[PDB]
Write an enzyme that holds these catalytic residues in place. Structure first.
Site, PDB file in Angstrom:
ATOM      1  N   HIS A   1       0.819  -1.209   0.000  1.00 64.85           N
ATOM      2  CA  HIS A   1       0.000   0.000   0.000  1.00 64.85           C
ATOM      3  C   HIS A   1       0.863   1.272   0.000  1.00 64.85           C
ATOM      4  O   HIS A   1       0.359   2.370  -0.222  1.00 64.85           O
ATOM      5  CB  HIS A   1      -1.051  -0.024   1.109  1.00 64.85           C
ATOM      6  CG  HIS A   1      -0.538   0.411   2.447  1.00 64.85           C
ATOM      7  ND1 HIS A   1      -0.196  -0.480   3.440  1.00 64.85           N
ATOM      8  CD2 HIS A   1      -0.328   1.650   2.957  1.00 64.85           C
ATOM      9  CE1 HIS A   1       0.191   0.191   4.511  1.00 64.85           C
ATOM     10  NE2 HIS A   1       0.127   1.484   4.242  1.00 64.85           N
TER      11      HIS A   1
ATOM     12  N   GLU B   1      23.114   9.293   6.639  1.00 68.78           N
ATOM     13  CA  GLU B   1      22.103   8.977   5.641  1.00 68.78           C
ATOM     14  C   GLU B   1      22.719   8.475   4.359  1.00 68.78           C
ATOM     15  O   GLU B   1      23.776   8.940   3.905  1.00 68.78           O
ATOM     16  CB  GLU B   1      21.234  10.190   5.293  1.00 68.78           C
ATOM     17  CG  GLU B   1      20.422  10.760   6.434  1.00 68.78           C
ATOM     18  CD  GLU B   1      21.163  11.810   7.225  1.00 68.78           C
ATOM     19  OE1 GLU B   1      22.387  12.003   7.034  1.00 68.78           O
ATOM     20  OE2 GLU B   1      20.507  12.462   8.043  1.00 68.78           O
TER      21      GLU B   1
ATOM     22  N   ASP C   1      -0.074  -7.408   1.667  1.00 68.46           N
ATOM     23  CA  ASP C   1       0.392  -6.043   1.706  1.00 68.46           C
ATOM     24  C   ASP C   1       1.904  -6.009   1.868  1.00 68.46           C
ATOM     25  O   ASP C   1       2.439  -5.716   2.931  1.00 68.46           O
ATOM     26  CB  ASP C   1      -0.306  -5.294   2.839  1.00 68.46           C
ATOM     27  CG  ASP C   1      -0.055  -3.801   2.762  1.00 68.46           C
ATOM     28  OD1 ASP C   1       0.461  -3.363   1.720  1.00 68.46           O
ATOM     29  OD2 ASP C   1      -0.395  -3.104   3.730  1.00 68.46           O
TER      30      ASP C   1
ATOM     31  N   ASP D   1       0.737   1.593  19.618  1.00 65.77           N
ATOM     32  CA  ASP D   1       0.411   1.071  18.290  1.00 65.77           C
ATOM     33  C   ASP D   1       1.293   1.739  17.282  1.00 65.77           C
ATOM     34  O   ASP D   1       1.935   2.768  17.584  1.00 65.77           O
ATOM     35  CB  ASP D   1      -1.037   1.421  17.994  1.00 65.77           C
ATOM     36  CG  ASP D   1      -1.663   0.606  16.857  1.00 65.77           C
ATOM     37  OD1 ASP D   1      -2.866   0.815  16.619  1.00 65.77           O
ATOM     38  OD2 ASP D   1      -1.005  -0.249  16.249  1.00 65.77           O
TER      39      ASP D   1
ATOM     40  N   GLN E   1      -0.431   5.850  10.981  1.00 63.87           N
ATOM     41  CA  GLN E   1      -0.147   6.414   9.667  1.00 63.87           C
ATOM     42  C   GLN E   1       1.275   6.950   9.626  1.00 63.87           C
ATOM     43  O   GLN E   1       1.691   7.653  10.538  1.00 63.87           O
ATOM     44  CB  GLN E   1      -1.102   7.558   9.359  1.00 63.87           C
ATOM     45  CG  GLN E   1      -0.812   8.173   8.008  1.00 63.87           C
ATOM     46  CD  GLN E   1      -1.941   8.999   7.503  1.00 63.87           C
ATOM     47  OE1 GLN E   1      -2.907   9.252   8.226  1.00 63.87           O
ATOM     48  NE2 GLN E   1      -1.845   9.428   6.248  1.00 63.87           N
ATOM     49  N   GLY E   2       1.998   6.656   8.544  1.00 65.39           N
ATOM     50  CA  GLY E   2       3.387   7.090   8.433  1.00 65.39           C
ATOM     51  C   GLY E   2       4.336   5.998   8.863  1.00 65.39           C
ATOM     52  O   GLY E   2       5.480   6.004   8.464  1.00 65.39           O
TER      53      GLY E   2
ATOM     54  N   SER F   1       3.452   2.930   8.166  1.00 64.66           N
ATOM     55  CA  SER F   1       3.095   1.958   7.124  1.00 64.66           C
ATOM     56  C   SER F   1       4.320   1.509   6.389  1.00 64.66           C
ATOM     57  O   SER F   1       5.130   2.338   5.973  1.00 64.66           O
ATOM     58  CB  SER F   1       2.196   2.589   6.078  1.00 64.66           C
ATOM     59  OG  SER F   1       0.884   2.686   6.539  1.00 64.66           O
ATOM     60  N   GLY F   2       4.433   0.200   6.187  1.00 68.28           N
ATOM     61  CA  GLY F   2       5.536  -0.338   5.382  1.00 68.28           C
ATOM     62  C   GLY F   2       6.736  -0.657   6.216  1.00 68.28           C
ATOM     63  O   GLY F   2       7.631  -1.358   5.792  1.00 68.28           O
TER      64      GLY F   2
HETATM   65  N1  LIG Z   1      -3.174   1.287  13.869  1.00 65.41           N
HETATM   66  C1  LIG Z   1      -2.232   0.929  13.097  1.00 65.41           C
HETATM   67  N2  LIG Z   1      -1.429  -0.029  13.504  1.00 65.41           N
HETATM   68  C2  LIG Z   1      -2.079   1.577  11.744  1.00 65.41           C
HETATM   69  C3  LIG Z   1      -3.151   2.363  11.342  1.00 65.41           C
HETATM   70  C4  LIG Z   1      -3.118   2.997  10.112  1.00 65.41           C
HETATM   71  C5  LIG Z   1      -2.030   2.865   9.267  1.00 65.41           C
HETATM   72  N3  LIG Z   1      -2.182   3.548   8.106  1.00 65.41           N
HETATM   73  N4  LIG Z   1      -1.208   3.893   7.328  1.00 65.41           N
HETATM   74  N5  LIG Z   1      -1.263   4.739   6.407  1.00 65.41           N
HETATM   75  C6  LIG Z   1      -2.297   5.589   5.957  1.00 65.41           C
HETATM   76  C7  LIG Z   1      -2.162   6.047   4.651  1.00 65.41           C
HETATM   77  C8  LIG Z   1      -3.088   6.921   4.099  1.00 65.41           C
HETATM   78  C9  LIG Z   1      -4.171   7.355   4.853  1.00 65.41           C
HETATM   79  C10 LIG Z   1      -5.154   8.297   4.202  1.00 65.41           C
HETATM   80  N6  LIG Z   1      -5.541   8.072   2.953  1.00 65.41           N
HETATM   81  N7  LIG Z   1      -5.594   9.302   4.830  1.00 65.41           N
HETATM   82  C11 LIG Z   1      -4.318   6.910   6.174  1.00 65.41           C
HETATM   83  C12 LIG Z   1      -3.378   6.026   6.726  1.00 65.41           C
HETATM   84  C13 LIG Z   1      -0.931   2.070   9.640  1.00 65.41           C
HETATM   85  C14 LIG Z   1      -0.967   1.427  10.895  1.00 65.41           C
HETATM   86 CA   LIG Z   2      18.266  12.658   8.628  1.00 62.84          CA
END
Ligand SMILES: N=C(N)c1ccc(/N=N\Nc2ccc(C(=N)N)cc2)cc1
Ligand SMILES: [Ca+2]
Length: 223
Positions: free
Chosen positions: A40, A62, A84, A171, A174-175, A177-178
């Site tokens: 994603h 870096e 994913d 937890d 967002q950010g 992710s990956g």
């Molecule tokens: N609760 C988590 N563990 C967790 C929750 C959300 C998550 N999402 N990642 N990225 C994400 C990417 C884009 C949007 C958006 N279109 N506004 C929202 C979230 C990654 C991990």
């Molecule tokens: Ca840096």
């Protein structure tokens, strides 16, 4: 990462930031020329930033390397986030050093209760938004599949696991992710999804890397 701690500069040397003008996802260095991230997180024009701590300041460790190729899992389903996982090949090999190090792929799957290190530059708030500049870390156990599937009825596949704290408070977000979920020295999870972040009974959902080791190794070997 919500409710985590500041990792400390380069303490998670396989943690990469994926940058397309800004940090948008984490990823884990699995060898000098390959990063694993969440499907994603797929975008064109990814620059992989290794050796990062403060992602907004050049601190001296870096390496920024453009992706030459992104390979999203053949069965990645963006609706469900099943599978994913994505590989990103770097245009040039990372110079491996103490601050830029690869993380081992699992040889087998981790079990419920195993403590993992989850890390990223994702949102640190469960309500609202604050993005940290330095890498945040969270120790979190893998949750039983049953609690995972109870938390997210009809959404958890065999390629996902939950990790974290049903109480809420801690937890990925967002950010993140990956990014990596590393358990006993192996990349067992990729930050995939959840409902909000650090909410009660909504643990993080993570791509179950150990399902993908054959695909990863074969894909890397062939690319
Ligand atoms: N609760 C988590 N563990 C967790 C929750 C959300 C998550 N999402 N990642 N990225 C994400 C990417 C884009 C949007 C958006 N279109 N506004 C929202 C979230 C990654 C991990
Ligand atoms: Ca840096």
């Amino acid at each position: 990462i919500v409710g985590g701690y500041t990792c400390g500069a380069n303490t998670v040397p396989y943690q990469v930031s994926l940058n397309s003008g800004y940090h948008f996802c984490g990823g884990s260095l699995i060898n000098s020329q390959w990063v694993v991230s969440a499907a994603h997180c797929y975008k064109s024009g990814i620059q992989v930033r290794l050796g990062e701590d403060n992602i907004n300041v050049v601190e001296g460790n870096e390496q920024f390397i453009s992706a030459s190729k992104s390979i999203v899992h053949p069965s990645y389903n963006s609706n469900t986030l099943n599978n994913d996982i994505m590989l990103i090949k770097l245009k040039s090999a990372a110079s491996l050093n103490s601050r830029v190090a690869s993380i081992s792929l699992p040889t087998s799957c981790a079990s419920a209760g195993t403590q993992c290190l989850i890390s990223g530059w994702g949102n640190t708030k469960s309500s609202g938004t604050s993005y940290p500049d330095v890498l945040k870390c969270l120790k979190a156990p893998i949750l039983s599949d049953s609690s995972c599937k109870s938390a997210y009825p009809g959404q958890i596949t065999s390629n996902m696991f939950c990790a974290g704290y049903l109480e809420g408070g801690k937890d990925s977000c967002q950010g993140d992710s990956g990014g990596p979920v590393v358990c006993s020295g192996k990349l067992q999870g990729i930050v995939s999804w959840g409902s909000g972040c650090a909410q009660k009974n909504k643990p993080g959902v993570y791509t179950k890397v150990c399902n993908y080791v054959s695909w990863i190794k074969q894909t890397i070997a062939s690319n």
